[PDB]
Structure formats: C-alpha cells, structure tokens
Amino acid sequence: IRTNIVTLQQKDESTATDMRELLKEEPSIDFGGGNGTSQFLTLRGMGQNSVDIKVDNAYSDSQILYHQGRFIVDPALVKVVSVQKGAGSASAGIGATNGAIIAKTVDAQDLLKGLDKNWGVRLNSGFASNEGVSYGASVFGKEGNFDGLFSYNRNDEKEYEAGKGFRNFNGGKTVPYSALDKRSYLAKIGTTFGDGDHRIVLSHMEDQHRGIRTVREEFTVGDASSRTNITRQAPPYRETTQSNTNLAYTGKDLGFVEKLDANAYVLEKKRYSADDKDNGYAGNVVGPNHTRITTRGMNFNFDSRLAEQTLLKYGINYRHQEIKPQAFLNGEFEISGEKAKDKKDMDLVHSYKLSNPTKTDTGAYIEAIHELDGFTLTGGLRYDRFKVKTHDGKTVSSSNLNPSFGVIWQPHEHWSFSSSHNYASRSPRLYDALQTHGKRGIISIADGTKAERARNTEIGFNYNDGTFAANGSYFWQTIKDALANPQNRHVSAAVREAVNAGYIKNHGYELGASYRTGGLTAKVGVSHSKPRFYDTHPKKLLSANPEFGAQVGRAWTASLAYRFQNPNLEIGWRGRYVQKAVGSILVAGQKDRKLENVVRKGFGVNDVFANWKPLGKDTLNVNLSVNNVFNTFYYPHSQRWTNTLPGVGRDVRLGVNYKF
Ligand SMILES: [Fe+3]
C-alpha cells in the first residue's frame, strides 16, 4: 500500500530492471530519460547536487561530469529500497540537507525466504521488446553461524525507441547510443556470534555500465546543424563502474551500550574511455583514459537506554573523498582570440603543479528520544566539520553546530501525526571528476567559504485502518549559502573558485490514499514542489543544470490491481501523469547562449502488468508487463527542458525468477 518503499519479494513480482521503473509509482521522485547515467534524479524537485543514494550506508557526493547523472544502483543487488523524502535528524549522518534514496544489498537470509532448507540457487531471465535481455544467477546459504552469497546479474539493453512521433537525426524511432551492457555482482559473507548478539558482514559489490556512449550522456545525436551532431557528440566505447567494499558490525547488550551499529567502507567510481580524443572535457586524451573517485568512510552509531522509554543516541561519521585522474593536463591550457591578459593567463595555468583534490567530512552527533503514552519527542545536535583541498593544493575549512527536533503523536491505533524542524549542513562538493586534469583552467575555492546550511520543516499525518489508508506531508526548506562551483565548463579561465552564491527555498506537499479489500488493491498519489534558487552575487553564479533540480509539474500516480486465488495471479494497471510545468529553478530566469521561457509539456503514461506464481508460492514468478501501452511520446521533467531524451515508448517485458 506504500509507494515510497519497495521490498525484495515485491520486486520479484515486477519486470523492471532499473530504479526509475521500479519507483515510478512514487510521485515525489522523478527520473530523467535515457539509460544509465543519462538519468538525472529529483526529490521534491531537488537534484543530485543535494540528494544522495546511500547503499549499505556508504555514499559519496562527487560527480563525474555535469552532462551526466550521478550513478544510480542496480536494483537486482538490493533487498529493499526506500525513499526518505525528508532529511532526518542528528543521527542521519553527513550532509543530510535533503532526503535520500536508501538501499540495502541482498542477504542469504532474504534469498532463502521461499525455501525449506539452508542453501539455494536463483536464476532469472528477462526479455524486453523495447529492447533488451537480462539474466542472472545467485548462490547462497547459511551453515553454523555463517551466511554467504554470490550474485551475478546482466542486463543487455539495445537502443530503445520512443513513443509515437519521435524521429532520430536519421529518421528512425530509436534513441542513438542508448545501449548499455549492464553487469553487476555481489559477494557477501556474514557471521553471527556472541550467543546471537553480534553480527559481522563483509561484502563486495561491482556495478558496471559498458557501451557506445556520447560525450554528453544527457543528450543524443541531433542533425549536422545542431550543437548535438555526430562529431560533436563523438561516441567511443566506455565503461562506467560503481564499486563498494563494506565491513558492517552490529552489537546488542554490550554493557551500558544497548545497540551499536558500525560500518567501514571503500567506494570507487571509475570512468573508462576507449578513446577520449574528441572529448574536450576529458582533455582529448588520445586512446585509453581512466578517471577514478575513491571514497573511504566510517560510521559508529551507539544507543544507550536512559530510562524504560528514553533512548540516547550518539556517534561519529568520517568520510574521505579523493578524485584521481590519469594525469594532469593544465600544460595544454589554451585561450582563444586584452589578449595580453590571455598570455599572462596561459602562463599562470602552465606553471601550476596540480594534485588530487580531496574532501574530509567529520561529524559527531547526540540525540535523545523520549516516548510517553503515544507521544514521542526527539531532539538532537550535530557538529559537522569539513576540509576541502582543491587540485591547486589550497585548503579551506569550516564547521557548524546543527540542532534538530521533531515529534510523533499517535492518539489512536489508526492515526499518527508528525512534525519536525531540522538544521543540517552540506560541505562543498569537489568539481567534476572528468575536468580535474586542469586543461580548462584551475578550479579552486574562495577563502572562508562555508557549508550550505539547511533548515527543514515539515508536518504530516498518517492513517491506516486495515482497509482505507492515507498519508500527507507538507514541507518547507531554506538552504542558506548555497554553493556554486564555477558553472561554465566550456571556456578557459585561469583561476575560478567555488563560493557561497545565494540561497534556496522549496516548499510543497505530497498525498497518498489506498483501498485494499481481499485481493483488490487501489492506490493514488500526488506530489508538488517549488524549488527556487536565488542569486545573491553580482555575477549570477547559480545554474539551472539538472544536477541542481527542476520545476517538475504536479505528479499524480495511481495503480489498480487484482490478485486471484486460483491460480496465484495478479493483474494490474499502473499510471503516472504529470501536469504542464512552467519556470526555471532560478528566480532571475535561465538563459541560452538570452532569457529562456521554460514550459514542460504534460503527459500520461499507462502500464498493465501481471504476476503469475505457478507453484502457489514465492519461489517462482513469471511476470508480464506492457509499459507505456499508448506508446506516449513525451519528455520526463527531471532534465533540461529543450527536447533532450524521451521516455521509453511502449515496452513489453517478460521476466522469470526461480529459486530452488
Ligand atoms: Fe557542455
């Protein structure tokens, strides 16, 4: 009945092989068009510059390049995915100025669900009309106090075709260079000891998109006239990869500490180009190019019980980030054609000895939870410190004290009410990994620049009597000292700096209602937001790039589904409709290369779907779907407004999964 979370068993009844399709019933997240990292993400209209994907509680905030979205995990690795729309209190961790996607990798215990034994094999296959094929396999089990798992998954997707009316630069229906060969695996071993009180989990996960991909992944190929032509978009072979090595600890009843949760991880993002020759951003490195972002981090979270219903929570977060290119290239630095200035400038850039940019985030927090007779009060405090070192070796540091509090009030067994007022900070992000080389100039940080500081406020209610269900939230957010890294990535300027450049206001709401009577499930959801960026700098420093957000149109979703008892079988309808949207995220208007009058056409997608459980149980699903049944030609709103990447046209899908 809840659209904000999807569980594993739910996903086994589903035919989708990426997050955007998996979460399409949740209205306050929106995805852009295109495949893999073509996709930008928004939460309440706010972009990946602000919203993190945390998997097993490991996450970074750096990007590869402003023309592509931050990597979004492959759902076949996860036992559960949540959207926390809100933020969270003092113990949410580093940078939680907005909500997040939260995901946890799958477990032996999870894969074992269907079965009457301690070991197992899983096989899946999928076929998609528009257009691709997927298969994988998984082995897992538990013995003595150990659990272990190995999973392999591959989704080979061809170029997809848009809905009725869209044409290619060469007259065809498909989206050029939208093919990716997607591979992922997971190795996991865990142990439970200390008379069942202590648990250790060690895991390694790879997730790799490989294919023929444009310079700027957010665009395809337009005709020879447009800035988007075949030699300007210049598609070589590329491999983009997320990796994650995680060590997780969990203790209960450890003296005066009631619960301890700890984790240490390494997180790598790599970009491999076969030939970056015709890619200016990467510096036209001829042949093989490798860019890497490494994130090391550590979290310790403690809970001590102070009275029968009063918990004290305290802990530490440390995160280190390192951008690491193949090689610096500020040597090749060049300005086009007072130009006396240019010359003193090329000179400057050439004499610079560049090094790997780094960012350390440290946090400590304390939080109290007091609960009495259906009324819960949470109050809390964080100290956030950061250190940023740019590729020019310059170091800037700041710290903040962040208070937060909230209440949950439950007067009655069907109803509950919540609100909160949280402060949180986010430290400047490092400039695009792919430009770190310096060819286009030095990217520094001005003296004394501060963390963006967010004030989040919200109220909501929740109602559920086993048959009707309903939920609502209203939220407000101010972000002060919004950071702007230097926005123009074309153009060669000698020294430019990240600064506090203005402030951000956003407000809006979501509603959900549902009805479930033996077999029949009905759901509706609506969500609307209003992110607005204000420049407080003479130079208007803020930008309308999708990484930041977009004014999405009011989004409505709905589904209707019936589960039969004979056979075990569910048929369903699902739709997402988004209304006409008007306006930039920027108050001062956004501009071409001149003032753009932004309007995003509205559109409606319908899907039908089926899930057939032939053995009367969860070990074999045969699923069938038809997505975008009317073959609606449209463009998602979470992306630029000039007609970039369409949403997939009618797609038909059949997937099977089988544990035994
Ligand atoms: Fe560009």
Residue numbers in the entry: 67 to 403, 421 to 676, 679 to 745
From the paper:
It is also known that other OMPs contribute to protective immunity, including the FrpB iron transporter (also known as FetA), which has been a component of several outer membrane vesicle-based vaccines. FrpB adopts a classical TBDT structure, with a 22-stranded β-barrel and a plug domain at the N-terminus, located within the lumen of the barrel. Sequence variation in FrpB from different meningococcal strains is mainly concentrated into a single region of approximately 40 residues, which is predicted to lie in an exposed location on the outer surface of the bacterium. In addition, we show that FrpB binds Fe3+ with high affinity, and that this binding site is separate from the antigenic region.
The FrpB F3-3 coordinates were then used to solve the structure of the FrpB F5-1 variant, which is a monoclinic crystal form with a monomer in the asymmetric unit. Data were then collected at high and low energies, the latter tuned to measure the anomalous diffraction from the bound iron atom. The highest peak in the anomalous difference map, at 11.2σ, coincided with the bound ion. A comparison of the FrpB F5-1 variant structures in the Fe-bound and unbound (apoprotein) states revealed two specific structural changes which apparently occurred on binding of Fe. First, portions of loops 3 and 8 were absent from electron density maps for the apoprotein form, but were structured in the Fe-bound state.
